[PDB]
Ligand binder design. Sequence first.
Ligand SMILES: CC(=O)N[C@@H]1[C@@H](O)[C@H](O[C@@H]2O[C@H](CO)[C@@H](O[C@@H]3O[C@H](CO)[C@@H](O[C@@H]4O[C@H](CO)[C@@H](O)[C@H](O)[C@H]4NC(C)=O)[C@H](O)[C@H]3NC(C)=O)[C@H](O)[C@H]2NC(C)=O)[C@@H](CO)O[C@H]1O
Ligand SMILES: [Cl-]
Length: 128
Amino acid sequence: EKRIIPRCELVKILREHGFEGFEGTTIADWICLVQHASDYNTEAYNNNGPSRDYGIFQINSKYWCNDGKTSGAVDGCHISCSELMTNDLEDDIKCAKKIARDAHGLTPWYGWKNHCEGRDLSSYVKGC
Ligand SMILES: CC(=O)N[C@@H]1[C@@H](O)[C@H](O[C@@H]2O[C@H](CO)[C@@H](O[C@@H]3O[C@H](CO)[C@@H](O[C@@H]4O[C@H](CO)[C@@H](O)[C@H](O)[C@H]4NC(C)=O)[C@H](O)[C@H]3NC(C)=O)[C@H](O)[C@H]2NC(C)=O)[C@@H](CO)O[C@H]1O
Ligand SMILES: [Cl-]
């Protein structure tokens, strides 16, 4: 299914949630991260087989949320994965902040490492 958050709305949400400087990250980092993870879809979903990724930050069921169907899992954010599939980003924000605090940055997100880190991210934050 699809329920998009537009780019500039997400920018405002993240700025107003103190994401600038969180664990040394930038707003642009998080926008680029979302574009490559979920394509701005709050009910983005990917079932890789061993684990599933949920919501706008593509949070993984092996480590961070419980979906009841992932073998060898731990639930680091102490939430059901279905909490991460809604228009209400509060649970996504809380959990992503924990993930980034534990890693002291954005390396848990493969899209960010592969398509954002060390690049010119001006386009993701201009024009709002
Ligand atoms: C198919 C595909 O590419 N899927 C993508 C998803 O993989 C990706 O979700 C991210 O998945 C990785 C790999 O499982 C995951 O990274 C692991 O995270 C755990 C928990 O932090 C690490 O285990 C910890 O290691 C630390 C030090 O690194 C220890 O101190 C700690 O004690 C260990 N913790 C526990 C609880 O076991 C793993 O080492 C680490 N593995 C790797 C290879 O990095 C990320 O957290 C997942 N990210 C998110 C946001 O959930 C998803 C997002 O990129 O995108 C899919 O496409
Ligand atoms: Cl920025």
